[PDB]
Structure formats: structure tokens, C-alpha cells
Design a protein around this nucleic acid. Structure first.
Ligand SMILES: [Mg+2]
Ligand SMILES: [Mg+2]
Ligand SMILES: [Mg+2]
Ligand SMILES: [Mg+2]
Ligand SMILES: [Mg+2]
Ligand SMILES: [Mg+2]
Ligand SMILES: [Mg+2]
Ligand SMILES: [Mg+2]
Ligand SMILES: [Mg+2]
Ligand SMILES: [Mg+2]
Ligand SMILES: [Mg+2]
Ligand SMILES: [Mg+2]
Ligand SMILES: [Mg+2]
Ligand SMILES: [Mg+2]
Ligand SMILES: [Mg+2]
Ligand SMILES: [Mg+2]
Ligand SMILES: [Mg+2]
Ligand SMILES: [Mg+2]
Ligand SMILES: [Mg+2]
Ligand SMILES: [Mg+2]
Ligand SMILES: [Mg+2]
Ligand SMILES: [Mg+2]
Ligand SMILES: [Mg+2]
Ligand SMILES: [Mg+2]
Ligand SMILES: [Mg+2]
Ligand SMILES: [Mg+2]
Ligand SMILES: [Mg+2]
Ligand SMILES: [Mg+2]
Ligand SMILES: [Mg+2]
Ligand SMILES: [Mg+2]
Ligand SMILES: [Mg+2]
Ligand SMILES: [Mg+2]
Ligand SMILES: [Mg+2]
Ligand SMILES: [Mg+2]
Ligand SMILES: [Mg+2]
Ligand SMILES: [Mg+2]
Ligand SMILES: [Mg+2]
Ligand SMILES: [Mg+2]
Ligand SMILES: [Mg+2]
Ligand SMILES: [Mg+2]
Ligand SMILES: [Mg+2]
Ligand SMILES: [Mg+2]
Ligand SMILES: [Mg+2]
Lengths: 118, 97, 196, 105, 55, 140, 288, 95
RNA sequence: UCGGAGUACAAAAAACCCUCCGAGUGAUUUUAAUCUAGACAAACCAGUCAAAAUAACCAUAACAUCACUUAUUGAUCCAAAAU
RNA sequence: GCCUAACGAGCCUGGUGAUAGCUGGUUGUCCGAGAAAGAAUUUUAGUUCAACCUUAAAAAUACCCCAAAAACCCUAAAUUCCA
RNA sequence: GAUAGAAAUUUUUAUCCUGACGCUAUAGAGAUAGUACCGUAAGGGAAAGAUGAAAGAAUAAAAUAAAAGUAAAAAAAAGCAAAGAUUACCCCUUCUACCUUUUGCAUAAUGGUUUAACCAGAAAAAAUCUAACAAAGAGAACUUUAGCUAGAUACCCCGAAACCAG
């Protein structure tokens, strides 16, 4: 039978080189995910279709942001072949309430707070 | 699909002719008339249909009961066959059961 | 109520012959197989030219139903109300006319701006003054009618309503009687305690 | 369909808007009924809007004919010689307004 | 059988019922029928409240 | 009350007018014509979608020609024009190629330059050189 | 009053030309024409159902039907012959008196209850009359002379406490019919029939003073009547010393339908006269 | 079921229903268990009891029996001495 | 038609003119009541458990047992019995 | 075999609009949602129940679900159940 | 079982106001006719009309010239016949007729030369929706622990071999 699939935890123990490679900090995990749906749910099992629905990933090539907490990481782990995950970065820091209109999200995965001054 | 080539004579109906102007006059005869005559009495028509209504089966059944013995042969026979057909149809055929 | 007035009287005599009532064609027009053509029973089937009608109207048909009393009463009340609110109701005394010339009536309605058509309601049939009967018998748009003949359809057909004064006293009572009334035990034509 | 019908190249009449812009709508003719219900919208339009419209567009003549008709029409007529017919039958005041604007532009 | 501004009656009814449900009760006003209609069974309390107002 | 369809004429005409220019009996007989017209419309919308691909392929062919003239293949020309932050869709590029042969030779020159710059930078193996045309501007 | 009226001045005449049925009143019917409702037209595909022939209602497809595998048991057994007593609570009786539909002044029997439309009897359904139930006992303050065809101890007590009188009387089906709708009976042009007796089953009910039966021995009445007052703990009033007492003692003959009329008379309602038989045989028959 | 009778043009009742079921006024139907008189020596005491019960029919059956039965059988009955009068109304049903 | 094992590897369910065993009852005495919360199972019909409470008995005394225990069975109507 | 060009039983009319779980057919436009089979059945060319689904309507939790938990010789992918 | 189905007992007010939300030549009667014609017989059973006030106005005068079929005018590489288009008809490019039936049809599975005219979803128990009045409602007969009354929403067409009577 084709079934769901366990994914042994050894997969998710990162090697020391990986930090260098994908550009994460060995010390501090990132706070937020940018998830994008790269592939299609057609031809995939219903349970993956549902996960993709409940992550707000319905529409392709649209970014969506999620907490980096384990509860979410479980679902992302299930559908990880359908998606692209990139850590959200805040060079200018979090937006205040004056900056809400001017926010924009750049493809390198970083959120710029002041967009197009004069 | 050819359509007539000439304008028909325009038919003028005057709405104020007697029958149209007086229409539905005594319909309230019961209420205003201290009930004596029910509006049924105003119905002109076949004896079995005055102040009564029903689907075709009920209609035929009733016609036969009332005027059946005054009917012509061919018409009575036709009426019977009609009844048998309607009986069979309504009772044994349909979608909804 | 207008719809009720229109339909409840109606009896359609329209009939069409089912394949059973057409004149002939008890026999199979040709043999079921081998002839090379389409198969048929009677030549009177609804497919065939002279044949019977598949559904079509059936028999004299009655459309008859009764709007419940209190509704038809409400109907009359509303018709009067609306005639009044729109300025087209005129309570008249009398009905005594100075003369039997209908032209008098026409020009009278022209002087008071009464509109094209007028419905004149009087208390009883025999008690109608003769001048009015004369005048209104030769008129198309003016219509004289007894109180028991008042109805929604006629009131909406004529632009202006003209009520005699005793007529108002009559209608008022007859119509109001229903707000306070019990449901009938047996028909109201029979003896009741207070009721005629 | 494209092979079914005629076609034309994109053009302007008299190189409009090159030197100066000339509103191409020349005249506008309404026909409605005072009595008939179908013309109801058209009547309201004649009351409220037409007047104002005529001031907004000084260069188009507007003829209004009450006549006994069942189907209110508006006939646009252009400098180009072109005549375009339209039916305002059974429409709002708003819809007629929009339509007349289309005709104007 | 409501003759008058029904909207007033709607105001008063939902203001009367609100402290009961913690929330404004759902309503339908039929202005032509002269009728008010309320989600839930409030019949007893409404009879009492209309009595108090002397109708 | 028997009701027949009186206006059947016009019902038919609204189909047949689309069929006039067909060959054969399709342009007359309502049966054949109805079918053919329906196929015509379907074919038409599908083609409405296709038309865009056709035109884009046309343009790419034309640009390919015009570039090959200057000794530059198509992919090279196009991506090295992108790497200059010159964004000109293919429609416009083809039109330049036909009606503005000079400006197009300029563009081709630009691209060839930028490409040579890229090779020079990949071969050089250092961060220091930035080719003049390889510099990346940000919005102001 | 109706501010709507004030708008009606502004608008054109209400005429036959503009009339709209209330929206939602007519759900428009749909016909099997067109792409949606055509081509098999809601009937499905082949089989017995598209052809219209699916079997009768209870038929399960040949397995022994549900409604026939269950065993027969008398439930509705002899139902047409059971006696049916339309209940009347003290609550409704009180509410009826309070609004002055029935008046407590004159004696209350079935006809009075019917005429107030406090109750409805249909003899055709084997209604044998009204039965009195105790629903409003605690709240019941009225003083009445009442006659019903059955009553419960608690109901009776509840009426006694207020100084009234209850009596249980029997009517046969024909009798009952006449009693509920008298005026249609008087247009019938027939004499007033004798009231039949109870059948053997109901005799022990109507012979007991327990039930204040109309056939009971009045010697027992005050005794049982007092027994009630012992049981429910209230002082039994002396009905004798009341001013309305003459009305309170009023009975019917066991053979008599109405109050003050007699078996065999004939009511001519157009002349407002009664007609009585002078014959010996007739008078022997009707008075037996 | 006959939907339109011949003589009266009305809708007949299927008596076979009236003999084995009982309709309360709430709309619940009540029936005996099947085989409750059959082969008793061969059965457990417990099972015997389970059989002796009066039980209720599920919705589907209830609608079926209603369709097979005319309006008369659904009227509110007041019988003297009736065992089942207690059960005709429904109480505290939150739905 | 009914049951046990495999097929169906670990909750349930799960087919074949698939692989294998069985059942259409004996033997015995502990002769195994009434009533009812709550559940299992289930298209329906049928099937299953079961506390408390009564009554029986030591005087605060309710599972018939064994044979792989699981299967040893049959609806309505209708007939015979009379409780 | 023959009985008026078709005789395993003539022809015609009537019963007759015979009856077909079988084949064929079933007529304007546009929009909202949308279905592959568990059970019985002289039943497997059909029905009637479930499960899904549609249209309204009332509600409150619904999927997803980490530990902990589910058998006795050996036994995998995995299930069940749940914050 | 499918189905069949009473009665006792109840109700019923005159005469005039007659016509048509019936058809208009494939409809409505089969009907111009039970004739022609077909059968030995019983029996079956058609189709068909259109000028005008006047044709005692035919060198005749007057308003459609619109179905398929043809003619005016045969064809010119290449392909479900069109569509995108195009200065340009073709030439280029892209699309495996339509119904039905099916697990699945371009299918070499079914049906249709074409045109016109005819030719097929019907019922109100429960329900929903709208409204009357409401512990009652219904113009008698019933139903009622918010109900009752009214309206509106619904269920096809052609076809056997047979069987029976005369
Ligand atoms: Mg025939
Ligand atoms: Mg025959
Ligand atoms: Mg052939
Ligand atoms: Mg036949
Ligand atoms: Mg005909
Ligand atoms: Mg697009
Ligand atoms: Mg329909
Ligand atoms: Mg369809
Ligand atoms: Mg079609
Ligand atoms: Mg089909
Ligand atoms: Mg099938
Ligand atoms: Mg009753
Ligand atoms: Mg379960
Ligand atoms: Mg115990
Ligand atoms: Mg022969
Ligand atoms: Mg058939
Ligand atoms: Mg079959
Ligand atoms: Mg699907
Ligand atoms: Mg069998
Ligand atoms: Mg189902
Ligand atoms: Mg777990
Ligand atoms: Mg949970
Ligand atoms: Mg049978
Ligand atoms: Mg003819
Ligand atoms: Mg003919
Ligand atoms: Mg032609
Ligand atoms: Mg080609
Ligand atoms: Mg096949
Ligand atoms: Mg299928
Ligand atoms: Mg294919
Ligand atoms: Mg093939
Ligand atoms: Mg071929
Ligand atoms: Mg094939
Ligand atoms: Mg073949
Ligand atoms: Mg083919
Ligand atoms: Mg076939
Ligand atoms: Mg075939
Ligand atoms: Mg076909
Ligand atoms: Mg063919
Ligand atoms: Mg109904
Ligand atoms: Mg439908
Ligand atoms: Mg036989
Ligand atoms: Mg047979």
C-alpha cells in the first residue's frame, strides 16, 4: 500500500557546513518563514492537498508568512517537496504603524520598510 | 418559416364595452349581501364544474358520476377509457413514487 | 384579490383529442420488421400527421378557489383606502340629478376634474333615482352599481369612485363587522344570536 | 468572427486631435412617449439631465420629440456622415446617461 | 399588528432583549405587513414587556 | 390555447448570417450551418488564445534574423540586454529591427559588449574589476 | 396613522396596469427546455426510473418488505369504537369566564362551551363529549354549575372549593351531535329525540356519586362530596344558602337533551313556536 | 399505494401498516420486534426480553409509513384509559 | 445459510468456481427470574453485553457447564394449541 | 401441408393509449454547486436502503494532530486514538 | 399481499342574465367524404380552397420575389473545409464532424440527403416560500400543546412478439 510517510529525525540534524552553505546563523534560529507553493497538489495524496490548504498556500508563487514554531514545522515537513521556504529578514527592523503603507517584500526574502521615498 | 407579407387589420378592442365594464361586479355578493348567496352561484358553466376544481382524473370521475347517464355512447365509452388510462398512469407511473 | 376575481370564475372549454379519441388507426400500419422503415402502432399516434395530441388541453377545466373571507374583506377596505388617499374618492349625498341628459353628467365630471371613468355606488337597486339610471344607461365610462356590487376589480378599472352617503354608512358597518367576529360555527345564512 | 465580418485600420476622422480636438458627435435626436411606460426612464432623462448635458457639450444639437411611440430611440449623428441608432427602451435614468455619454465620446 | 414607526419598536425590543442574551438579537422588520420578527423564543418575556407599556 | 412560433425566421437568420461565407451546403441549410457555425466560434476563441503565441514566435524569429546579421545569436543578444537593465519586450525589439536598423545595431553592440565583459569577469577570477556596463543601478 | 398613505399622494394611480405579487410569493415553475433542464430532463438514464416504471411504495426490491416483516399487533385494534373525550382544563375554563365567553351565571353545559368556541366536538370521530382536567386547579377562582361527560377527582374538588356544582352526564352519539349544534338540528324539521342511556360498560361510572354521575343516587352525593373536602383540606360551603342556588341545583332528565325542552317537541323557528304532541302513544313513547 | 382512488379520487391508506404500527402524534412510530412469538424455548431470557419490547422506527421508515398512510391516522386522539396518551407529546427536545 | 484459520503482518472493514478445517448438535444438572442506567454492532430486519433496583434461595445467596464454543439456525402471514 | 402473395395457427374490428427492468427520442439563454458503488434482492440489464452529494435551516466545534496508550512465539510499510 | 371499500347519518333555493385567456386548411371533425381509392368480405380510408367593388374589368390590373432545389456563374496542388489572419480568394499556421451509447468512440459503433410544418414532464400527502387570522383557523361536516386557511412550487414520447371476445 501507498501510505503516509515517516521521516526519520536524522534528516533534520543539520551538518556544520550547511550553516555556511544556506546562510543561516549557527547560534540563533530565524523567527519567520516565507513559504511559497512551487509545485501542484494535483497527482498528490489528499492529505498533502489539505495541508497545502491549511497553510494558506492555495495559490502558486505567492509568498505567505508562518511562525517557525514546531506546530507549523510539522505540516511544512509533510509538504516540503511542494514548497520553497526562505527565512524572512528585517534589515530595517519590524514595521511601525507609520510604515504600514510603504512596506514591500523583496525576492531575496527581505522586508523593506521604506519603499520609494520621493 | 415564411411570415405573412401584409399587415393584419388592426383589431380595436374597446375596453368599455358592456361585458368588460361590468366585470366582476357581484363577486362580493356574500360579504356585502349578508351572506345568502355564495359567489359560487355566479359561476356559469358545465353542471359538474360549478364551484369545484380537480386534476383531470378527478374531473372525469366526477363528470361520469354526475352526467354519465345522459351521455352519448361514444362519449361515455371514451370517458371510461380515459378514466382507466388516467388511473393507471397516476397510480402506477411517475418519477416520485 | 384582483387576480382571484379574475380567475375564480373562469372555465376553459378547450379540448384536444388524445390519440385514443381520434377516428381510426386501430391497426399496425405495416409489419414490425423487414419493411425497412420506422416502426409504428396506430397511424393516429402523436407523431403522425393527423394524429392525436400528446398533451394538450383536456376537458372543460375549472380554475376555482376561494380566498378566505377576511382576506377579501381586507381587499375591499384597502381598495377604498387607496381610492381615498389618492384623492379619487368622492362622497356624494343624494344622487338626485337635475336632468336625464347624459351630457350633463359628462360635463360635470369635466368641471370637477374627475377623470375619464367614474363608478357610482348607490345603496339599493330599486331605489336608484330615475334621472341617474337614464343618464348612466347610455354612457360607456360611467357605471352605476348597487352597494352589494362593489368590488376590487371595478374600483381599479374606474379612475374615480363616487359613494352615496347611506352607502358609506352601509359599507363601514358590513366591513367592520369582521374584525370582531367569531369563526362561523355553521353558515351565516342560518340563525345566529345577534346576527341577521 | 473575424473572417466573417469587415475590418478597418485604426484611423481618426480629419486627423482629429492633431491640431485641435473636435467633438465628432454632431446631433442627438430623442423620440419618446409622454404616456407609455417603456419610455419612463427616457422621460426622467429629459427632465433632469438633458439640459445639463447640453451645456457640457455646446457643439451638439439636441432635438427632443414627444410622439406616440412604443420604443424610445436616440439617433446619434456624426460629422463623419455616420448615423448610429440606439434603443433607450426600458432603461434607468442612469443607464441612458451612460449611453448618451458613450455616444458623445 | 404594529401601527406606527416599527423601527422604534425594533430599537426598543433589541434594547430590551440585549441584556438577556449578552448580544443584540437578530431581527426582521416587515414594514408593509406591520410586523416584527425575532430569532429565538422570547414570547413570554415580550408579552410581559408589552403589558408593562400598556398596549 | 394553441401557441405556435411565429418569428422562427429571425431565429434562423441569427445563425445563418455567420454561415454565409462558408463553402458548400453549410451556408444554406440550418442544420449543417448551425453545426459549422458553432465549430467556427469555438475554433475562433481557441485561436484568440493561440494568436498571442504565434505573434510572439514571429517576433522572436525576426529578432533572431536581425541579430544574426550582426554576428550575434538570439539568446546571447536577449539576456545580455537584460543584464544591462534594458527592458524592451520582444514586440518592440522586432519593430526596432525592421524600422530602426541603426538603433538596433546599437543595441546589438551594447549586448556584445556586455557579454564580452561577462566573459572577462568570469575569466579574471577577482572581485575588483567591474565592467563599465556591468554595473547595476538602483532606482531613485 | 399609516405614514404609507402620505406617500400614496405622490405616486400614480393604483390601477390594474401596475400590480405586483409579493416577492417570493410565486416560485416560478421550470420546464424541460433548453440545455439545463432538457436532455433526460431530470429523469436519469435508462433503467426503470427514466422510463417511469419504478415499483410501488413499500417495495424494497424483492427482499421481504420492512412494513411486512414486522408482526401484526393490536395497536389500532378496534380504534373506531373507542370513546374519545375532548379535554377541557380549568385553565381554559377560567380564561373563558374571565373574558366573558361563557357566563357562570346560567348553567354551563356542552352547548355553552361550544358556543363560546372554548371547545370543539366532532361526534363523527367518536367524540363522546368533554372531559374536565385539573390543569388550572390552583388558580381557579370562578363559581360554576358545570356539566361534563367525565371529570377527575382533582378537577371536581377544585370546583367544589369555590362553591359550585359538577355533574357528569352521558350522551349517545346522535344526542351529542344534536347537543353541540342545535340550530342546524332545528332546521331539520324533526322531533327532539330521546336521550339514550349509557351502555353496560359506562354504567358503573355514571351510577357512582364518586363521579357525581347524573344517574347516581343523590343520597350518596353529600357524603362523597364531603369526603373530597376531607381529602383536599378545605371547608365545604353550603350551596343551599346561596342566592344563585336555584340555578345551581338545575338538572336535566336522564332522557332529556336540553334545558327546558322535552323529548318529542318540535321547534318551528320561523314562527318562534314550539309544537307538542297531544297523542297518547307519542307521549308514552317520548316520555319513557 | 393508491394516490388517486377510482370512486372518490382521494388517496387510500395501506391497511397492512395500520395493523402493525402505531403512530404517536409527535411523528414517532412504534412497532413490535420481529419473531417475538417465535421459538421461545430456544432463546435466552435476555434475548426474550429484548424481543418483548416496543421500539421506535428510524426517520426513513417513519417517512415511508407516513406516505403509506392517510391524514386520518395522524390526528390528535384522546382516548379514555389510553396507555399511550402519556407519550404523544415531546418534551425538552433541543434541536 | 452459519462458524474458525489464512488471504487481510500492528484499530475496524475487506473479494475470488481462493487456500484449509468445521456446523444443521449432543452430554450433563448448577433448571439458569423480573425490571431497567448505559453501550457494542448495524442499510433495514436481525444480533450482542450490562450496573443499580426488585423477588428467589446461604437467610447482605442471579455468568448453566463441557465438547477448538465460536456455529448448532429461519421473517411475516397462516395454521394448530388455550393461557 | 393447406385454409385469398407472411399459418407452430387466418383476417378484421374491439378490449387498446395492452405491457415492456429492453432500444430509440426528449425543444430558449446564462449562473451556483456536483456525484464510481457497502447491504439485501428469481438479484447482479433492475430496485430499495446506507455512505457520499444538492437546497434550505439550526448549532458547535471540526479536520491537522506531540508525548502517553492498543497481545499473547516471530513479524514491514504503517494504522487507531488524541493536546 | 397488490389492492378493494361501504352504510346509518348528514348537506343541497326558484326562473332570466350563453357563451369561449377553443381551432383557423399538416390545426379543428375522418370529412369538400365515409366519397375516391385499397380489400373476396368484414373492413380500411385519403388529398385537396385562396384575384378584385366588379372578370357582363384576361393588348388584364395589383402589393412577397425571402425555405431546400436550381439558374444568372464548372473547375485549378493540400486535406471535418473553418479559424488566425492578410494588401491579397487560395497558398501559411492551428484544430481527429455532431448526436447517442459507453470503462473508453475521428472511429471502420448508432442515427440523419436536405427544407418547411408538426412532434415528447401531468398530479400537491409531508415539506419549503408568501400572505390572512391567531389559542384558535376555515363561507358546515375538519384540524389544532402555534396552529390553521389560501396561493405558488411535481412526476415524458414512440415501439413488440403476444393474450381475449366477436
Ligand atoms: Mg383505437
Ligand atoms: Mg389489435
Ligand atoms: Mg435500412
Ligand atoms: Mg401497440
Ligand atoms: Mg386532429
Ligand atoms: Mg490571457
Ligand atoms: Mg411542470
Ligand atoms: Mg440536462
Ligand atoms: Mg439536442
Ligand atoms: Mg437514452
Ligand atoms: Mg442502467
Ligand atoms: Mg377534536
Ligand atoms: Mg458504532
Ligand atoms: Mg444486580
Ligand atoms: Mg394470408
Ligand atoms: Mg409503452
Ligand atoms: Mg433487469
Ligand atoms: Mg467526477
Ligand atoms: Mg426469493
Ligand atoms: Mg438513497
Ligand atoms: Mg501519537
Ligand atoms: Mg482533536
Ligand atoms: Mg406477495
Ligand atoms: Mg384536415
Ligand atoms: Mg384529415
Ligand atoms: Mg433559394
Ligand atoms: Mg489549407
Ligand atoms: Mg464495450
Ligand atoms: Mg455511467
Ligand atoms: Mg480520441
Ligand atoms: Mg475502429
Ligand atoms: Mg471513413
Ligand atoms: Mg468502435
Ligand atoms: Mg454495425
Ligand atoms: Mg459513424
Ligand atoms: Mg444501441
Ligand atoms: Mg448497437
Ligand atoms: Mg442516435
Ligand atoms: Mg444511415
Ligand atoms: Mg399540502
Ligand atoms: Mg423539478
Ligand atoms: Mg393468461
Ligand atoms: Mg403473460
Amino acid at each position: 500500500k501507498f501510505t503516509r510517510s515517516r521521516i526519520p529525525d536524522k534528516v533534520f540534524q543539520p551538518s556544520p557546513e550547511d550553516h555556511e552553505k544556506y546562510g543561516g546563523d549557527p547560534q540563533y534560529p530565524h523567527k519567520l518563514h516565507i513559504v511559497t507553493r512551487i509545485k501542484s497538489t494535483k497527482r498528490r495524496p489528499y492529505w498533502e492537498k489539505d495541508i497545502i490548504k491549511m497553510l494558506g498556500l492555495e495559490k502558486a508563487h505567492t509568498p505567505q508568512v508562518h511562525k517557525n514554531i514546531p506546530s507549523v514545522n510539522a505540516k511544512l515537513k509533510v509538504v516540503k517537496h511542494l514548497i520553497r521556504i526562505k527565512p524572512l529578514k528585517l534589515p530595517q527592523g519590524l514595521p511601525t504603524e507609520e510604515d504600514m503603507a510603504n512596506t514591500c517584500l523583496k525576492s531575496n526574502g527581505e522586508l523593506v520598510v521604506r519603499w520609494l521615498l520621493n | 418559416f415564411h411570415v405573412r407579407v401584409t399587415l393584419p387589420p388592426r383589431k380595436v378592442v374597446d375596453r368599455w364595452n358592456e361585458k368588460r365594464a361590468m366585470f366582476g361586479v357581484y363577486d362580493n355578493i356574500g360579504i356585502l349581501g349578508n351572506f345568502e348567496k355564495h359567489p359560487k352561484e355566479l359561476i356559469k358553466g358545465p353542471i359538474w364544474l360549478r364551484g369545484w376544481k380537480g386534476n383531470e382524473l378527478q374531473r372525469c370521475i366526477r363528470k361520469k358520476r354526475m352526467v354519465g347517464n345522459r351521455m352519448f355512447i361514444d362519449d361515455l365509452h371514451n370517458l371510461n377509457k380515459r378514466i382507466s388510462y388516467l388511473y393507471k398512469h397516476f397510480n402506477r407511473h411517475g418519477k416520485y413514487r | 384579490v384582483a387576480i382571484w376575481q379574475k380567475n375564480f370564475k373562469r372555465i376553459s372549454y378547450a379540448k384536444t383529442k388524445t390519440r385514443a379519441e381520434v377516428r381510426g388507426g386501430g391497426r399496425k400500419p405495416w409489419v414490425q420488421k423487414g419493411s425497412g422503415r420506422a416502426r409504428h402502432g396506430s397511424i393516429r399516434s402523436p407523431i403522425w400527421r393527423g394524429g392525436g395530441v400528446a398533451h394538450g388541453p383536456r376537458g372543460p377545466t375549472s380554475y376555482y378557489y376561494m380566498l378566505p373571507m377576511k382576506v377579501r374583506v381586507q381587499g375591499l377596505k384597502v381598495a377604498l383606502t387607496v381610492k381615498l388617499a389618492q384623492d379619487d374618492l368622492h362622497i356624494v349625498d343624494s344622487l338626485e340629478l337635475p336632468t336625464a341628459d347624459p351630457q350633463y353628467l359628462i360635463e360635470l365630471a369635466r368641471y370637477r376634474r374627475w377623470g375619464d371613468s367614474v363608478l357610482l355606488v348607490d345603496l339599493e337597486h330599486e331605489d336608484m333615482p330615475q334621472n341617474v339610471v337614464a343618464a348612466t344607461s347610455g354612457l360607456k365610462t360611467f357605471n352605476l352599481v348597487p352597494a352589494v356590487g362593489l368590488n376590487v376589480h371595478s374600483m381599479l378599472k374606474h379612475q374615480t369612485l363616487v359613494l352615496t352617503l347611506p352607502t358609506v354608512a352601509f359599507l363601514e358597518e358590513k366591513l367592520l363587522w369582521h374584525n370582531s367576529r367569531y369563526t362561523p360555527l355553521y353558515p351565516f345564512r342560518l340563525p345566529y344570536c345577534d346576527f341577521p | 468572427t473575424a473572417r466573417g465580418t469587415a475590418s478597418r485600420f485604426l484611423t481618426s476622422v480629419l486627423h482629429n486631435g492633431l491640431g485641435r480636438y473636435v467633438q465628432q458627435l454632431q446631433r442627438l435626436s430623442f423620440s419618446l412617449s409622454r404616456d407609455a411606460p417603456s419610455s419612463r426612464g427616457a422621460r426622467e432623462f429629459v427632465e433632469r439631465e438633458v439640459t445639463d448635458f447640453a451645456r457640457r457639450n455646446p457643439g451638439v444639437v439636441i432635438y427632443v420629440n414627444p410622439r406616440p411611440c412604443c420604443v424610445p430611440r436616440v439617433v446619434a449623428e456624426y460629422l463623419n456622415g455616420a448615423v448610429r441608432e440606439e434603443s433607450i427602451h426600458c432603461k434607468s435614468v442612469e443607464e441612458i446617461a451612460a449611453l448618451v455619454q458613450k455616444l458623445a465620446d | 399588528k404594529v401601527e406606527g414607526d416599527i423601527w422604534a419598536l425594533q430599537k426598543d425590543v433589541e434594547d430590551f432583549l440585549s441584556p438577556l442574551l449578552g448580544k443584540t438579537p437578530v431581527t426582521q422588520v416587515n414594514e408593509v405587513t406591520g410586523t416584527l420578527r425575532v430569532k429565538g423564543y422570547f414570547d413570554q418575556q415580550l408579552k410581559a414587556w408589552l403589558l408593562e407599556k400598556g398596549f | 390555447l394553441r401557441s405556435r412560433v411565429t418569428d422562427r425566421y429571425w431565429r434562423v437568420q441569427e445563425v445563418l448570417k455567420h454561415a454565409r461565407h462558408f463553402r458548400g451546403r453549410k451556408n444554406r441549410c440550418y442544420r449543417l450551418a448551425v453545426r459549422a457555425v458553432t465549430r467556427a466560434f469555438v475554433k475562433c476563441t481557441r485561436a484568440r488564445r493561440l494568436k498571442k503565441r504565434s505573434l510572439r514566435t514571429l517576433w522572436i524569429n525576426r529578432i533572431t534574423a536581425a541579430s544574426q546579421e550582426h554576428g550575434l545569436k538570439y539568446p546571447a543578444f536577449i539576456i545580455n540586454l537584460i543584464k544591462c537593465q534594458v527592458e524592451l519586450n520582444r514586440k518592440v525589439l522586432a519593430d526596432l529591427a525592421i524600422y530602426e536598423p541603426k538603433t538596433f545595431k546599437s543595441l546589438a553592440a551594447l549586448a556584445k559588449r556586455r557579454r564580452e565583459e561577462g566573459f572577462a569577469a568570469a575569466l579574471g577570477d577577482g572581485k575588483e574589476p567591474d565592467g563599465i556596463f556591468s554595473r547595476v543601478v538602483q532606482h531613485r | 396613522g399609516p405614514r404609507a398613505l402620505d406617500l400614496l399622494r405622490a405616486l400614480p394611480r393604483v390601477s390594474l396596469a401596475n400590480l405586483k405579487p409579493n416577492p417570493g410569493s410565486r416560485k416560478p415553475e421550470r420546464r424541460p427546455r433548453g440545455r439545463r433542464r432538457g436532455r433526460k430532463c431530470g429523469r436519469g438514464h435508462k433503467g426503470e426510473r427514466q422510463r417511469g416504471t419504478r415499483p410501488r411504495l413499500g417495495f424494497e426490491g424483492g427482499q421481504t418488505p420492512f412494513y411486512l416483516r414486522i408482526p401484526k399487533y393490536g395497536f389500532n385494534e378496534g380504534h373506531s369504537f373507542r370513546h374519545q373525550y375532548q379535554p377541557l382544563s380549568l385553565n381554559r375554563l377560567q380564561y373563558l369566564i374571565d373574558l366573558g365567553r361563557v357566563d357562570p351565571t346560567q348553567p354551563i353545559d356542552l352547548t355553552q362551551l361550544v358556543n363560546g368556541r372554548g371547545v370543539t366536538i366532532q361526534p363523527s370521530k367518536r367524540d363522546y363529549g368533554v372531559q374536565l382536567v385539573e390543569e388550572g386547579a390552583d388558580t381557579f377562582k370562578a363559581k360554576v354549575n358545570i356539566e361534563v361527560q367525565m371529570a377527575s377527582e382533582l378537577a371536581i374538588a377544585a370546583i367544589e372549593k369555590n362553591g359550585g356544582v359538577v355533574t357528569t352526564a352521558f350522551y349517545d352519539p346522535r344526542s351529542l351531535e344534536i347537543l353541540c349544534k342545535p340550530v342546524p338540528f332545528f332546521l331539520r324539521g324533526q322531533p327532539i329525540p330521546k336521550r339514550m342511556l349509557p351502555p353496560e360498560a359506562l354504567v358503573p361510572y355514571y351510577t357512582d356519586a364518586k363521579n357525581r354521575g347524573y344517574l347516581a343516587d343523590p343520597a350518596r352525593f353529600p357524603e362523597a362530596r364531603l369526603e373530597l373536602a376531607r381529602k383536599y383540606g378545605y371547608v365545604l360551603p353550603d350551596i343551599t344558602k346561596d342566592e344563585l342556588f336555584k340555578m345551581l341545583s338545575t338538572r336535566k332528565d336522564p332522557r332529556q337533551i336540553f334545558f327546558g325542552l322535552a323529548p318529542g317537541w318540535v321547534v318551528n323557528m320561523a314562527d318562534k313556536k314550539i309544537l307538542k304532541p297531544t297523542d297518547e302513544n307519542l307521549l308514552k313513547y317520548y316520555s319513557s | 399505494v393508491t394516490y388517486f382512488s377510482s370512486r372518490k379520487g382521494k388517496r387510500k391508506t395501506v391497511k397492512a401498516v395500520i395493523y402493525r404500527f402505531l403512530r404517536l402524534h409527535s411523528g414517532l412510530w412504534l412497532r413490535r420486534k420481529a419473531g417475538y412469538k417465535k421459538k421461545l424455548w430456544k432463546k435466552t431470557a435476555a434475548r426474550k426480553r429484548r424481543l418483548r419490547e416496543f421500539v421506535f422506527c428510524n426517520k426513513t421508515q417513519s417517512k415511508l409509513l407516513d406516505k403509506m398512510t392517510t391524514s386520518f391516522w395522524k390526528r390528535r386522539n384522546w382516548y379514555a384509559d389510553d396507555p399511550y396518551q402519556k407519550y404523544q407529546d415531546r418534551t425538552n427536545l433541543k434541536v
